[PDB]
Coordinates of C-alpha atoms and ligand atoms in Angstrom, one line a residue:
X17 CA 21.7 -8.0 22.9
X18 CA 22.3 -3.8 20.6
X19 CA 23.2 -1.9 17.9
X20 CA 23.1 1.1 19.2
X21 CA 20.1 0.2 21.4
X22 CA 19.2 -3.1 22.7
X23 CA 18.0 -5.5 20.3
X24 CA 17.4 -8.5 21.5
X25 CA 15.9 -11.4 19.5
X26 CA 16.6 -14.6 21.3
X27 CA 18.3 -17.6 20.4
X28 CA 17.2 -18.3 16.7
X29 CA 18.4 -14.9 15.4
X30 CA 22.1 -14.3 15.1
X31 CA 24.8 -11.8 13.9
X32 CA 23.0 -8.3 13.7
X33 CA 23.6 -5.2 10.7
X34 CA 22.2 -2.1 11.6
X35 CA 19.7 -1.7 8.5
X36 CA 17.6 1.8 9.2
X37 CA 15.2 3.6 11.4
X38 CA 11.8 2.9 11.0
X39 CA 8.2 4.6 12.5
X40 CA 8.4 2.8 15.8
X41 CA 11.9 0.9 15.9
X42 CA 15.0 0.0 14.2
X43 CA 15.1 -2.2 11.7
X44 CA 18.1 -5.0 11.0
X45 CA 19.0 -8.0 9.3
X46 CA 20.3 -11.4 10.5
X47 CA 20.7 -14.5 10.7
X48 CA 17.6 -17.1 10.9
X49 CA 19.0 -20.2 12.1
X50 CA 16.0 -22.5 11.9
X51 CA 16.0 -21.8 8.5
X52 CA 19.4 -21.1 7.1
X53 CA 19.2 -17.7 5.9
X54 CA 19.3 -14.2 6.7
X55 CA 16.0 -11.8 7.1
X56 CA 14.5 -8.6 8.2
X57 CA 13.6 -7.6 11.7
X58 CA 11.6 -4.8 12.9
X59 CA 12.0 -3.5 16.5
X60 CA 8.3 -2.0 17.4
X61 CA 7.7 0.2 20.6
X62 CA 4.2 0.8 20.1
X63 CA 2.9 0.7 23.3
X64 CA 3.3 4.7 24.9
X65 CA 0.7 6.1 22.1
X66 CA -3.0 5.1 21.6
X67 CA -2.5 5.3 17.8
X68 CA 0.7 3.9 17.7
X69 CA -1.3 0.5 19.0
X70 CA -3.8 1.0 17.1
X71 CA -1.4 0.7 13.7
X72 CA 0.7 -1.8 14.9
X73 CA -2.7 -4.0 15.9
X74 CA -4.2 -3.4 13.4
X75 CA -1.1 -4.0 10.1
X76 CA -0.7 -7.6 12.4
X77 CA -3.5 -8.9 12.1
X78 CA -3.9 -7.8 8.2
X79 CA -0.4 -9.6 7.8
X80 CA -1.2 -12.4 9.5
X81 CA -4.5 -13.4 8.1
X82 CA -2.9 -13.1 4.6
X83 CA -1.5 -15.0 2.6
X84 CA -0.3 -14.2 -0.4
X85 CA 3.9 -14.3 -3.0
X86 CA 3.7 -10.6 -3.1
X87 CA 2.3 -9.1 0.2
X88 CA 5.3 -9.0 3.5
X89 CA 4.7 -11.8 5.4
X90 CA 5.1 -12.1 8.9
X91 CA 8.2 -15.4 9.7
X92 CA 7.7 -14.9 13.6
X93 CA 7.4 -12.9 16.2
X94 CA 9.0 -11.4 19.4
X95 CA 8.1 -10.3 22.4
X96 CA 7.8 -11.4 26.2
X97 CA 6.1 -13.9 27.8
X98 CA 3.7 -11.7 30.0
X99 CA 2.1 -8.4 29.1
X100 CA 4.0 -6.4 31.7
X101 CA 7.2 -6.9 30.5
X102 CA 6.2 -6.7 26.1
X103 CA 7.3 -2.9 26.1
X104 CA 8.5 -4.0 22.2
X105 CA 8.0 -6.1 20.0
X106 CA 9.8 -7.8 16.9
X107 CA 8.9 -8.8 13.7
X108 CA 10.8 -10.7 11.5
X109 CA 10.0 -11.0 7.7
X110 CA 11.6 -11.6 4.4
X111 CA 15.1 -10.2 3.4
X112 CA 13.8 -7.9 1.0
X113 CA 16.9 -6.0 0.2
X114 CA 15.7 -3.0 -2.0
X115 CA 12.6 -1.3 -2.7
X116 CA 10.4 0.2 -5.7
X117 CA 11.1 3.9 -4.6
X118 CA 15.0 3.7 -4.1
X119 CA 15.0 1.7 -7.0
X120 CA 13.4 4.3 -9.8
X121 CA 15.8 6.6 -8.1
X122 CA 18.6 5.3 -9.8
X123 CA 18.1 2.4 -12.3
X124 CA 15.9 2.7 -15.5
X125 CA 13.8 -0.4 -15.7
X126 CA 13.1 -2.0 -19.0
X127 CA 9.7 -2.8 -20.8
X128 CA 9.5 -6.4 -19.1
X129 CA 10.5 -5.5 -15.8
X130 CA 7.8 -2.2 -15.7
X131 CA 5.6 -5.6 -16.9
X132 CA 6.4 -7.9 -14.5
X133 CA 5.8 -5.6 -11.6
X134 CA 2.9 -4.2 -12.4
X135 CA 1.4 -8.0 -13.0
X136 CA 2.9 -8.6 -9.5
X137 CA 1.4 -5.2 -7.7
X138 CA -1.8 -6.2 -9.3
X139 CA -1.6 -9.8 -8.1
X140 CA -1.5 -8.9 -4.7
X141 CA -4.0 -6.2 -5.2
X142 CA -5.9 -9.0 -6.5
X143 CA -5.9 -10.5 -3.2
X144 CA -6.1 -7.6 -0.7
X145 CA -9.2 -6.0 -2.8
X146 CA -11.2 -9.9 -2.6
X147 CA -9.9 -9.9 2.0
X148 CA -12.3 -6.3 1.0
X149 CA -9.7 -5.1 2.5
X150 CA -8.6 -1.8 1.0
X151 CA -4.5 -0.8 1.0
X152 CA -5.0 2.5 0.7
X153 CA -1.1 4.2 0.9
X154 CA 0.0 2.4 -2.1
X155 CA 3.2 3.8 -3.1
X156 CA 6.7 2.4 -4.3
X157 CA 8.2 2.8 -1.1
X158 CA 5.9 0.4 -0.1
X159 CA 6.4 -1.8 -2.5
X160 CA 9.8 -4.3 -1.7
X161 CA 11.7 -6.3 -4.0
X162 CA 14.5 -8.8 -3.1
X163 CA 17.5 -9.9 -5.2
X164 CA 15.1 -11.4 -8.4
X165 CA 12.6 -8.7 -8.4
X166 CA 9.9 -10.7 -6.6
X167 CA 7.4 -8.1 -5.4
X168 CA 6.1 -6.9 -2.6
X169 CA 3.6 -4.8 -1.1
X170 CA 3.7 -3.9 2.6
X171 CA 2.8 -0.9 5.3
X172 CA -1.1 -2.4 5.6
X173 CA -0.8 1.1 8.3
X174 CA -3.4 2.6 6.9
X175 CA -5.7 0.1 5.4
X176 CA -9.3 -0.5 6.3
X177 CA -12.3 -3.0 4.9
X178 CA -14.1 -1.2 2.3
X179 CA -17.4 0.4 3.3
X180 CA -18.4 2.0 -0.2
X181 CA -21.9 2.9 1.1
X182 CA -20.4 5.6 4.2
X183 CA -17.7 7.0 0.9
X184 CA -19.2 10.7 1.1
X185 CA -17.6 13.3 3.0
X186 CA -17.3 17.0 2.3
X187 CA -15.3 19.2 0.7
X188 CA -11.5 19.4 2.0
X189 CA -11.8 16.9 4.0
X190 CA -8.2 15.9 5.8
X191 CA -6.4 12.6 4.8
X192 CA -3.8 11.4 5.8
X193 CA -2.5 9.0 2.7
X194 CA 0.8 10.1 0.7
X195 CA 0.2 13.1 -1.4
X196 CA 0.9 11.8 -4.4
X197 CA -0.5 8.4 -4.9
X198 CA -3.8 10.5 -4.0
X199 CA -6.8 9.9 -6.2
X200 CA -8.8 12.8 -7.3
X201 CA -11.8 11.5 -5.6
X202 CA -10.1 12.1 -2.0
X203 CA -10.1 15.6 -2.4
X204 CA -13.2 16.3 -3.6
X205 CA -16.4 14.2 -1.6
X206 CA -14.7 10.7 -0.9
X207 CA -13.4 9.3 2.5
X208 CA -11.3 6.3 -0.1
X209 CA -13.8 3.6 1.8
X210 CA -13.8 1.9 -2.3
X211 CA -11.4 -0.1 -3.9
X212 CA -10.8 2.6 -7.0
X213 CA -8.9 4.9 -4.4
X214 CA -6.2 1.4 -5.0
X215 CA -6.1 1.3 -8.7
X216 CA -5.2 5.0 -8.9
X217 CA -2.6 4.8 -6.9
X218 CA -1.5 1.5 -9.0
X219 CA -1.8 4.5 -12.1
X220 CA 0.5 6.7 -10.6
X221 CA 3.1 4.0 -9.9
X222 CA 2.4 3.2 -13.6
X223 CA 3.6 6.7 -14.7
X224 CA 6.3 6.4 -12.8
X225 CA 8.1 3.3 -13.9
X226 CA 7.7 4.7 -17.7
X227 CA 9.5 7.2 -16.7
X228 CA 11.6 7.7 -13.5
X229 CA 9.2 10.8 -11.9
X230 CA 6.8 11.1 -10.3
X231 CA 3.3 11.9 -12.5
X232 CA 1.3 14.3 -10.5
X233 CA 4.1 15.6 -7.9
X234 CA 1.5 18.1 -6.3
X235 CA 3.0 20.1 -3.1
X236 CA -0.2 20.3 -1.6
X237 CA -4.3 19.7 -1.3
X238 CA -5.4 21.4 -4.3
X239 CA -2.1 21.8 -6.1
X240 CA -2.8 17.8 -6.1
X241 CA -6.0 18.5 -8.3
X242 CA -4.4 20.9 -10.5
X243 CA -1.8 18.5 -11.6
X244 CA -4.1 15.6 -12.5
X245 CA -5.9 17.9 -14.4
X246 CA -3.2 19.5 -16.4
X247 CA -2.4 16.1 -17.9
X248 CA -6.2 14.3 -17.7
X249 CA -7.8 17.4 -18.2
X250 CA -11.0 19.1 -17.3
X251 CA -13.6 16.5 -16.2
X252 CA -17.1 16.0 -18.4
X253 CA -20.1 17.5 -17.7
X254 CA -21.3 13.5 -16.6
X255 CA -18.7 13.1 -14.8
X256 CA -19.1 16.5 -12.5
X257 CA -22.9 15.4 -12.2
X258 CA -21.7 12.1 -10.3
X259 CA -19.7 14.8 -7.7
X260 CA -23.3 16.2 -5.5
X261 CA -21.1 18.4 -3.4
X262 CA -22.2 21.7 -4.5
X263 CA -18.9 22.7 -3.0
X264 CA -16.1 20.4 -5.2
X265 CA -18.5 21.2 -8.2
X266 CA -18.2 24.5 -7.8
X267 CA -15.0 24.3 -6.8
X268 CA -14.1 22.6 -10.5
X269 CA -16.4 25.1 -12.4
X270 CA -14.1 27.6 -11.1
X271 CA -11.3 25.8 -13.0
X272 CA -10.0 26.8 -16.1
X273 CA -10.7 24.4 -19.0
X274 CA -7.7 22.1 -19.8
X275 CA -7.7 19.7 -22.4
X276 CA -6.3 16.4 -22.1
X277 CA -2.6 15.8 -22.9
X278 CA -1.8 12.8 -24.2
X279 CA 0.0 9.6 -23.1
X280 CA 2.0 9.4 -25.6
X281 CA 3.3 12.3 -25.7
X282 CA 4.1 12.2 -22.1
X283 CA 5.5 8.8 -22.3
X284 CA 7.0 8.5 -25.9
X285 CA 9.4 5.7 -25.4
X286 CA 6.1 3.6 -23.4
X287 CA 4.5 0.5 -24.9
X288 CA 1.0 1.2 -26.6
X289 CA -0.7 -1.3 -24.7
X290 CA 0.7 0.3 -21.2
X291 CA -0.5 3.5 -22.0
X292 CA -4.4 2.2 -22.5
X293 CA -4.3 0.8 -19.5
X294 CA -2.4 3.7 -17.6
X295 CA -5.6 6.0 -19.2
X296 CA -7.6 2.8 -17.6
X297 CA -6.1 3.0 -14.1
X298 CA -6.2 7.0 -14.5
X299 CA -9.4 7.6 -15.5
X300 CA -10.9 11.0 -13.1
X301 CA -14.5 8.5 -12.7
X302 CA -13.8 6.3 -10.1
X303 CA -16.7 4.1 -11.3
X304 CA -15.5 4.3 -15.0
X305 CA -11.8 3.5 -13.7
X306 CA -11.2 -0.3 -14.7
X307 CA -11.0 -2.9 -11.4
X308 CA -8.2 -5.4 -10.6
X309 CA -9.5 -8.3 -12.4
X310 CA -10.3 -5.9 -15.5
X311 CA -6.3 -4.8 -15.5
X312 CA -5.0 -8.2 -14.5
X313 CA -7.1 -9.1 -17.9
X314 CA -6.0 -6.1 -19.8
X315 CA -3.1 -7.6 -22.9
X316 CA -0.6 -5.3 -21.4
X317 CA -0.5 -8.6 -19.1
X318 CA -1.1 -10.9 -21.3
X319 CA 1.5 -13.3 -20.6
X320 CA 1.4 -13.1 -17.1
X321 CA -2.3 -13.0 -17.1
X322 CA -3.2 -17.2 -15.3
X323 CA -6.4 -17.0 -13.3
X324 CA -5.7 -20.0 -11.7
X325 CA -2.8 -18.9 -10.4
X326 CA -3.9 -15.3 -9.1
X327 CA -5.2 -16.4 -5.5
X328 CA -8.3 -15.0 -3.7
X329 CA -8.8 -14.4 0.0
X330 CA -10.2 -17.8 1.4
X331 CA -11.1 -15.8 4.7
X332 CA -12.5 -12.2 3.7
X333 CA -12.5 -9.2 7.4
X334 CA -16.3 -8.4 7.5
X335 CA -15.0 -5.8 10.3
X336 CA -14.1 -2.9 10.5
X337 CA -11.9 -4.2 13.3
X338 CA -13.7 -0.9 15.6
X339 CA -9.8 0.6 16.3
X340 CA -10.8 4.0 16.9
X341 CA -13.0 3.3 20.2
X342 CA -9.9 1.6 22.0
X343 CA -7.4 2.8 25.4
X344 CA -4.0 2.0 24.9
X345 CA -4.5 -0.7 27.6
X346 CA -7.2 -3.1 25.9
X347 CA -4.6 -2.1 22.5
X348 CA -0.9 -3.4 24.0
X349 CA -3.6 -6.3 25.5
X350 CA -5.2 -7.3 21.7
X351 CA -1.3 -7.2 20.2
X352 CA -0.4 -9.9 23.6
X353 CA -3.5 -12.2 21.9
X354 CA -2.4 -11.2 18.4
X355 CA 1.1 -12.5 18.9
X356 CA 0.6 -15.5 20.9
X357 CA 0.8 -17.9 18.6
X358 CA 4.3 -17.4 17.7
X359 CA 5.3 -18.8 21.9
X360 CA 7.2 -21.5 21.7
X361 CA 4.4 -24.0 22.1
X362 CA 0.9 -23.0 23.5
Ligands
LIG401 N1 11.2 -6.9 4.9 C1 12.3 -5.7 5.2 N2 13.2 -6.1 4.4 C2 15.0 -5.6 3.8 N3 14.7 -4.3 4.7 C3 13.3 -3.8 4.8 C4 12.4 -4.6 5.5 N4 11.5 -3.6 6.2 C5 12.1 -2.7 6.1 N5 13.4 -2.3 5.5 C6 14.2 -0.8 5.5 O1 14.0 -0.5 7.3 C7 13.7 0.7 6.9 C8 12.9 1.2 7.4 O2 11.7 0.8 6.8 P1 10.3 0.7 7.9 O3 10.1 0.8 8.6 O4 8.7 0.3 6.3 O5 9.6 2.8 7.7 P2 9.7 3.5 6.7 O6 8.4 3.1 6.5 O7 9.4 5.0 7.2 O8 10.4 3.7 6.0 C9 13.0 1.1 5.9 O9 13.4 1.9 4.8 C10 13.8 -0.3 4.7 O10 14.9 0.4 3.9

């Protein structure tokens, strides 16, 4: 009982400590006396709002279907026995003492750690993309790490089934993912329904790991683009030709010419294979951008690369879930159903 508020985790979990505050409730560590290991437990109270319900359901569905060393698992779910009584859900996960965002705030990464973390990020992303899922909010704070540097991808709140045929949109379309890790096509002509938008975000994370600072810290949506172009240089005519939308193409054509700033001038201490890989992930044209499996096969990752130990999903989401269409009541109801596998005998 209680830790500020009610935090009622049944017989199995003992001695709580407040960790922090999530989007839907509080988070504590607790002791799991079936595994005799300390765990993380997130209290989620989403059922008032159709949008909270939608993101909860989506995340629960994905994380239960995923099974991978580099993606956070759900170990258990605690909730009331009936829909009427269910006001909260508790999600139990492996305890991950830190995240890449906290770590980069104060710690220098060795080349060996940059390389290791990048490998793990790509190995988990390979699994995700093989399930036809796009993460769509990759950033240092969504990469959890435990005291031995196991890295796990988390927060699938914004994730979607890939839909490369319906990716096109107009100029300056409303986007929800964290600004600094957004690929340039999101501002221009993309809904972010192609895998290449995740590779762009991993590129930004690499750049950040190389220098301890965000590489593209735009303050707003066209500033994000002026940041990208000030480094990559003006897009070539060939790359412009791929942007059919007139307003987006005319915007780029109105900007002053900018030359590329070479990577090794920005990152003079970086391994030169890291920079070669970085260049390939931060390429303006999303069809020329490197894919996950090619990145895993790049010379920079040669000490880790082993395709037989880089699993793909057995069970792809054909979907999408069709989650926009549903009232709060059907969603709470689907969450109940989705969490039933954790109830003592069923
Ligand atoms: N598996 C975990 N292990 C340890 N601490 C965690 C875990 N998940 C979340 N936390 C901590 O609790 C806080 C709230 O997390 P979260 O619900 O993801 O909210 P937000 O994404 O807004 O930070 C996080 O900032 C994190 O530091």
